[PDB]
Design a protein around this nucleic acid. Structure first.
Lengths: 176, 62, 23, 214, 146, 37
RNA sequence: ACAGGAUAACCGCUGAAAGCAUCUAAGCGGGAAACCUCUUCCAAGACCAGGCUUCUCACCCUCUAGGAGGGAUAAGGCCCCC
RNA sequence: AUGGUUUGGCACCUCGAUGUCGGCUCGUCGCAUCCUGGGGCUGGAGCAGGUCCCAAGGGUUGGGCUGUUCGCCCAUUAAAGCGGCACGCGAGCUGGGUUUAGAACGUCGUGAGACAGUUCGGUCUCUAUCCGCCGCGCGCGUCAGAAGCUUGAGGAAACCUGUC
RNA sequence: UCAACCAUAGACUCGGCGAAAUUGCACUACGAGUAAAGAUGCUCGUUACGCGCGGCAGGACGAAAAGACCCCGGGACCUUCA
RNA sequence: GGGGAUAAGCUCCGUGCGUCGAGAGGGAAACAGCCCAGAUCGCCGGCUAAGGCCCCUAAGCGUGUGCUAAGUGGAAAAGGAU
């Protein structure tokens, strides 16, 4: 509601397209699609923007309004700017490298962990201890980055594992 | 059988009986069924009679 | 127990009117 | 793929491997099989190959069977059987009139052999289901091999379906899996398969590639 | 006396119901009605004077709520522990027609005449049926008003 | 996780929610995690 | 067994309602010897009694030729026989 | 509060008979899971655990004592689960115990005799009609009669695990 | 442990003679229920072509014996400072 | 109202209270004691009660306004709960 009321400003390098609830955007980074929930009114504003409102005030509509607005916001900013997540690694021997477009971690296992890059996602390695995922869907980005984050069990005693950039994990101490 | 023939004439059994009792048709269900089987036209005529004798808003107290 | 419970709750019906033999 | 063949069991014997270790084998006359019909999805709803095996006089053949073998375009055989496949790409290899021999297999291949178990007749629950019997002493009145109890009591009040009782054992289709062929012998047209095979000697079998181990 | 059919009075008509976005029980009640003959004034409960009922697009049947995942079609083999359950979604993707069948069969009488009435029910998961020679009438599931 | 019919906050960070038909309690402190059951 | 699918507990992503947050309300994923598939076996009396093929695919008589009844046959099968 | 397995309360079927404990055999079910499997929290460094959640697919030893169930013990184990099914199962077995008649000890009783006291001994009947179950046939049907090869709705089986 | 095999007498098959206990009936299913509180027979469903043969013994609260235990009533015999 | 654990389909009393007993019929799925109603017989006539009107199953997938998302309805406590 309070999120859904403010529309989304469309930059220049954007090509929006609608047939009803459906939606297809194009930008420099690629293209994207979205079939909006039916009770949420969608319109293409005169001021180079996408307005989204709700006819009723039922809780379902109030939820879907703000959600759809945020979804279009993420959609356009991904298809124009992109969506990146920088990750980094801690612990001796805990490293990663790029085997083409897939990644290969060593994380103290008896074998290397091969992460296959799915469609729409592109990886990168600023360093064996610092890497990044990039794409246009925030969902898929966070999904694969979390799949990466959960590759090793949490190690609050010595921090050995994958983390996000500015992550403040919990910690303990095992004295004995 | 009456319900069948009535719903074929686009009316329910209950409102048919209601309309017949309002129209003063003392015909019994036996003969109504026999009409429905043997004289569907006469059944339709009685259906029209009952639909006329019914009120304009059957869901009103009156 | 379940059997007695069900048999007693049977009395909470529109027909039985909150009473039944052996409740 | 799951290439296969019909044959006849001849009997067991020994061989010795390169390590001088003994191998109990069964010799299967995996013989000249001939393809008589192709099963397709556009015709039959499933992909398979109909094979035929066993020399037979053309007078002991039932005339419908003769007509089938004729319209195929081959001479009749005794036993006929289908091999199910996985796809039209797998059935496209088999042509009618094609001849299959033991050479489709190779030494070290793993096979599944389907045969018809030997008949043990009307068997008791001991021989049939491995029931412990009861005591041969200590008072046992005439229950030395009897199954004992058969169900519960009134609460069940019946015998559950599938209870293990006396009856005919054997003459059942048995697939023994993952038998390693010790040797192919195309000169004789046989397979030396490591270990037991279902059925009597002279019994028909189907040696197929192992659906688990390639 | 009251009418009874005699050996050639049972006329058969073929109806066809598009089960696309139609409620399962709604459709099944209507189809059972037609199959039994309640829609006919010659209805005699000791006679399968009903009509043939084709159902198409059974896979596109509509099921409300969480019934697609939390309503189970149970089945027993006769053997102990031989209860096998399968949800309606599992049943729709495996055997689409079975849900519509089971619904109608339960809505029908459980008797010899019910068995005879099942035979007039044809159910097909697509929009197409082979019973076009029989010239089936489309049957929209209405509601008589009052 | 604790699974009890009485799930309630334990500190000021413990937040209560209804997730998938179950009353959950979440927190930074995973000790305070709870679920109704 | 391998493998796959859908899942439990659980881990989550994107995210509102509730300017934040939230694994969820719309959506998207992962996830167990359980479940379905997979393996083996029975199975069309599966009364929706299935399917692909092949064979015989042909005679008489009586009732008054209506609907049948009887006989002789084919393909084939059964019995006897080893 | 659950459950209904314990001791009980009631005395509702059964006293013109519903055979009892324990074991043997055969199992089947539930999960309130002993192992195996998955996971959360941990005062979880790691090994190993504790606790909770999910999970009933399979598996869940052999012996000494005792009638015994139970239990203790011995060795093992991955584990040596808890319960229901007439405290499953005696028209399937045993019959050691309880629970007839014999006899004896102790105690009680004047006595005959008695003892949820002990002790030794002590008939376990029945040709399966029906259901059910295991298997096997005969008939008819599946819109002519036959034959061969088959699909697989739907069921059954199997599903364990250690050491290095 | 841990059971396997052989023969014989039965069981099985054919011929011949030919009983029995029992029996309210009968074209005598299963589940969950309900019910004199443990159902072939009732309810709702599920399953099941008809008829036999050999077998097993879970039920028919199976047969047998008007429960011996318990109680009530009555006997009998026994004891004794009735 | 007593006894009982203010348990028992428990027991013992009271009640110009009822029903069964000795009472069919309809409803309550089935179901002596609950609800309706007290069966002179017959009728292929009608109105009703209780209870019900999507199909099984006779009658309404009734009308209007709201509520419910839990298949609640179509068992349950303390207590927990944006």
């Amino acid at each position: 509601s309070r999120i859904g009321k403010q529309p989304v400003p469309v930059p220049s390098g954007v090509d929006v397209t609608i047939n009803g609830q459906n939606l297809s955007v194009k930008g420099p980074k690629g293209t994207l699609t979205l079939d909006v929930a039916e009770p949420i009114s969608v319109s293409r504003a005169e001021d180079g923007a996408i307005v989204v409102t709700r006819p009723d005030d039922e809780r379902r509509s109030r939820s879907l309004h703000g959600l759809s607005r945020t979804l279009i916001a993420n959609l356009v900013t991904g298809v124009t700017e992109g969506y990146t997540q920088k990750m980094e690694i801690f612990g001796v021997g805990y490293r990663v490298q790029l085997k083409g477009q897939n990644l290969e971690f060593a994380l103290g296992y008896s074998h290397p962990v091969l992460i296959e890059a799915p469609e729409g996602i592109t990886f990168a390695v600023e360093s064996p201890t610092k890497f990044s995922v990039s794409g246009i869907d925030k969902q898929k980005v966070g999904q694969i980055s979390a799949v990466i984050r959960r590759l090793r069990r949490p190690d609050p005693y010595k921090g050995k594992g994958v983390r996000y950039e500015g992550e403040q994990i919990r910690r303990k101490v095992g004295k004995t | 059988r009456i319900n069948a023939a009535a719903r074929a004439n686009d009316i329910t059994y209950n409102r048919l009986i209601q309309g017949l009792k309002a129209a003063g048709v003392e015909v019994d269900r036996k003969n109504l069924a026999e009409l429905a089987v043997s004289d569907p036209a006469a059944f339709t005529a009685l259906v029209d009679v009952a639909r006329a004798a019914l009120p304009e808003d059957v869901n009103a107290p009156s | 127990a379940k059997r007695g419970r069900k048999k007693r709750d049977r009395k909470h019906s529109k027909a039985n009117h909150g009473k039944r033999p052996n409740a | 793929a799951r290439k296969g063949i019909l044959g006849t069991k001849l009997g067991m014997t020994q061989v010795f491997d390169e390590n001088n270790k003994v191998v109990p084998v069964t010799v299967v006359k995996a013989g000249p099989n001939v393809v008589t019909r192709i099963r397709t999805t556009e015709r039959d709803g499933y992909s398979a190959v109909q094979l035929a095996y066993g020399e037979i006089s053309p007078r002991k053949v039932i005339k419908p069977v003769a007509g089938q073998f004729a319209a195929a375009g081959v001479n009749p055989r005794r036993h006929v059987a289908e091999l199910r496949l996985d796809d039209e790409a797998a059935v496209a290899e088999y042509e009618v009139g094609q001849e299959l021999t033991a050479e489709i297999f190779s030494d070290g291949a793993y096979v599944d052999v389907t045969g018809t178990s030997k008949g043990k007749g009307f068997a008791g629950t001991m021989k049939r289901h491995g029931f412990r019997g009861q005591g041969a002493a200590h008072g046992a009145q005439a229950v030395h091999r009897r199954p004992g109890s058969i169900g519960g009591c009134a609460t069940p009040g019946r015998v559950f379906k599938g209870t293990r009782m006396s009856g005919r054992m054997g003459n059942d289709r048995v697939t023994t899996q993952n038998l390693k062929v010790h040797k192919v012998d195309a000169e004789n047209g046989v397979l030396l398969i490591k270990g037991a095979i279902p059925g009597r000697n002279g019994g028909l079998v189907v040696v197929r590639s192992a659906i688990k181990r390639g | 006396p009251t009418y009874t059919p005699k050996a050639g009075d049972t006329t058969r008509s073929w109806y066809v119901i598009d089960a696309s976005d139609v409620v399962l029980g709604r459709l099944a009640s209507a189809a059972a009605t037609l199959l039994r003959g309640k829609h006919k004034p010659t209805f005699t409960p000791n006679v399968d004077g009903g009509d043939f009922v084709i159902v198409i697009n059974a896979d596109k049947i509509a099921v409300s709520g969480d019934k697609l995942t939390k309503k189970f079609a149970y089945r027993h083999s006769g053997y102990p522990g031989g209860l096998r359950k399968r949800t309606i979604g599992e049943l729709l993707e495996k055997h689409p027609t079975r849900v519509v069948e089971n619904a109608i069969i339960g809505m029908l009488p459980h008797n010899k005449l019910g068995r005879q009435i099942q035979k007039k029910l044809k159910v097909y998961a697509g929009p197409d049926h082979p019973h076009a020679a029989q010239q089936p009438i489309p049957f929209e599931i209405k509601q008589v008003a009052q | 996780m604790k699974v009890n019919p009485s799930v309630k906050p334990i500190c000021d960070k413990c937040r209560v929610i209804r997730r998938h038909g179950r009353v959950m309690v979440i927190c930074s402190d995973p000790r305070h995690k709870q679920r109704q059951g």
